[PDB]
Design an enzyme around this catalytic site. Sequence first.
Site, short mmCIF file in Angstrom:
data_model
loop_
_atom_site.label_atom_id
_atom_site.label_comp_id
_atom_site.label_asym_id
_atom_site.label_seq_id
_atom_site.Cartn_x
_atom_site.Cartn_y
_atom_site.Cartn_z
N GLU A 50 33.13 39.89 57.51
CA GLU A 50 32.77 38.76 58.35
C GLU A 50 32.48 39.09 59.82
O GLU A 50 33.23 38.67 60.71
CB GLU A 50 33.84 37.65 58.23
CG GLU A 50 33.97 37.12 56.79
CD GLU A 50 34.88 35.90 56.65
OE1 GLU A 50 35.62 35.56 57.59
OE2 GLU A 50 34.85 35.26 55.57
N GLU A 61 34.83 36.74 48.64
CA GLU A 61 35.84 35.70 48.92
C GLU A 61 35.39 34.32 48.46
O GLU A 61 34.28 33.88 48.78
CB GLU A 61 36.22 35.64 50.41
CG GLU A 61 37.10 36.78 50.89
CD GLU A 61 37.56 36.62 52.32
OE1 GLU A 61 37.64 35.47 52.81
OE2 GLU A 61 37.82 37.65 52.96
#
EC number: 3.2.1.21
Lengths: 449, 454
Positions: free
Chosen positions: B174, B362
């Site tokens: 991220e 995720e």
Amino acid sequence: DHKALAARFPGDFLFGVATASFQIEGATKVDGRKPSIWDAFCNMPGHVFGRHNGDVACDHYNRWEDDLDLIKEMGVEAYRFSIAWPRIIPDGFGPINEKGLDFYDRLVDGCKARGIKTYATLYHWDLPLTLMGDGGWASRSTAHAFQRYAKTVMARLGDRLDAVATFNEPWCAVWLSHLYGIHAPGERNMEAALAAMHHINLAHGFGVEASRHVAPKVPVGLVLNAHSVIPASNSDADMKAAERAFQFHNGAFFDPVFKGEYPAEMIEALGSRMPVVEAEDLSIISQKLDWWGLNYYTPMRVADDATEGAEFPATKQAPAVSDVKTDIGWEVYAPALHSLVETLYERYELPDCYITENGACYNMGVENGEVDDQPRLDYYAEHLGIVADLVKDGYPMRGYFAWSLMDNFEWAEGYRMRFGLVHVDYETQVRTLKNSGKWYSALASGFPK
Amino acid sequence: AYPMTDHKALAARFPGDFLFGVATASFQIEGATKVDGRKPSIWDAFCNMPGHVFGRHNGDVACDHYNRWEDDLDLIKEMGVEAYRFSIAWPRIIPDGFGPINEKGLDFYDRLVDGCKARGIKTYATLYHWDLPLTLMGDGGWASRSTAHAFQRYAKTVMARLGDRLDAVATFNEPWCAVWLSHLYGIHAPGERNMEAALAAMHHINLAHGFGVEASRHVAPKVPVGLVLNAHSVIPASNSDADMKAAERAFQFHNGAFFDPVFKGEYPAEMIEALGSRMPVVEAEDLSIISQKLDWWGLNYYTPMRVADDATEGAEFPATKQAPAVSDVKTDIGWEVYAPALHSLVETLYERYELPDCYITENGACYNMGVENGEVDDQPRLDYYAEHLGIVADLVKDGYPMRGYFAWSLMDNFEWAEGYRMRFGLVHVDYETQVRTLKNSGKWYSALASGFPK
């Protein structure tokens, strides 16, 4: 007229020049030094003008000897300087860096040899970056890291130091750093700031005890920029405002240290958001000091702020009265020094006082091998006149240190704001005594009489 | 036809070699923050300074995974889950960021990887999941180009030790969070709010990614290399030309800042027109290093990013504002549940960029129910999984190269600014006792996953 002025001072009056480690040393990765919170603050865009840092500064680490000779050549009796914790115990806790201690050991020896009195500051804002991992000053453990640091420094230097101050300007290290976000570590949070407040008061206390255990002969003090708070008007609202402002900006430090308690109205407003105050803290914080240091530049003019919800002390900035301004924007208003000292000695039971910082930002450089900084000279003549008045009035003013032996890194302003009595060319590192410096040298040279 | 469980019907929708896993991150689970040579990370600092993290919760203890890692792997094994996505703590490996290598740090992950091997568990390692060594902040952190080289050396060191055994490696988790959320919005460590700082972090993290790809392949050429992005599913409020353009600016800023350099070797043009003057220096080989070919990429998805044009004068690029949710269905952390946004995101990305195989690295839901009669009744989490896994199966059917899925959270853990209050686990952790309890959603996921590979 430096001769008539000199007549007004006691024969044993102490004249000094002042300096701080991060501001002048440079050599930030040399001989085991690890980063400080100011190395981080400088290098992150947004915090410091031009992203200026302390990497080179005035190169004092390498040039300390020439700088000591300059002080002696100026005939100034005392040198106020700070010790870099990141050199001494680089991670804050952890192993002592003996080579860091060696630097100041050598410096202090150099001063002894030259008859230059040493006024060392243990903490002048350069907290080892590693301690931020624990919460920095928001964590009580950081006071204990300082306790061990103070002991380490005083064990080595305590046989020779003429005086020691634990902290320089808790107001900056606390509110300016944790509430206003202007100084490292740049936080804006009341809980964080209140924790820093109590833990710096506590670390001061730890420092007093530590220094006295290992070096009982050295006079211990604390250096404070107490604000000369002046209300915008004589209205009741502005009067009460001035008092709240005094409790928050000064009382948060003076009351614990000199009365063993926090300001009552401030505790009403903010006490629920404070860290734990253990049974012994206030008595530790309020150990007797041998002297204290006042840093003064400008008054703090305040007006009541009636805005709903406004956090204590609920004030706003009021405009300058004087029209004189230093290049950094600070009102020149000397009589505020007088009312401040007057107020403090009336309100608190204080030891001897040294003016540990006083000076002015004026950015003129070198022309014809000289620096014409008449407004700085005028600033000094005027405020030293006030200090002489305070002596005549019977206040225990024992000495005076000019803020800035030389131009240096001025915190959030970087190198743009010059405060020196000596000009530094940052490209060549050439020192040039300014006209203010020549004037101050002539005054100081005749002391002791 | 006779009644069948939902998990059994769903399983039939996935290819026989589909990879199912569970995911964690080092600071979120490990604890042991001050042992075996580890030095503080920026998150230790962030946690311990009042104001940044709920309850001033920190990672000192967390799930005590540093001491219980074998129990946790036995749990994975029992659950019949094939793969484990985890991160490696830079503060354990090279504790000052630069400087001497900490052998004890390497030993821990060496032993963890051997434990996975011994159990037949595939390893998907993340090199950087936000725990930058605090010491690096001294030079400016991600705002300083030097930090990209510090990461490069760390990546090389890890991969030289673990590369003979890892099944896959991602450089970063991220970038959006480590860049914007951390340097512009002030919500994640180091907590800055500065466009100049953020843009520097942006480029230096992109650069660090590329340095890491090269380093990994230099010393471990057999390991598939990827990057994990929470690419945002941007959904305009209307199809008015203004909203369609706002959605485009949002996409460039929130996704393009990372996807375009990595997959096109350039920054988005309209973003540069707006932000270029405040970017750091881009050197000659930079975009070329950043845009090396990847073997896979990881998508983190939870919720859509709904946007509308923001007409406020002076509004900084991308000049958008929040648009309303289409449903009132929200998780306990407050995020809209809207599974179709995952389909439109993947459809959008695959047509705009030339991408390698995708793994959902995720996906999960915050629901905070605890233990009752020895069980955790978390049907809304189970429902969230069934629906989103349905979308993933749809994408496989629609021809997208979805190779695997990692349920976010093996167990409850430290949820960054939310502290321990927000639980994402398939397995409940009682933080008083450290007892793990498989939740109903975890039992359901185990039942799905256990049948793979078919």
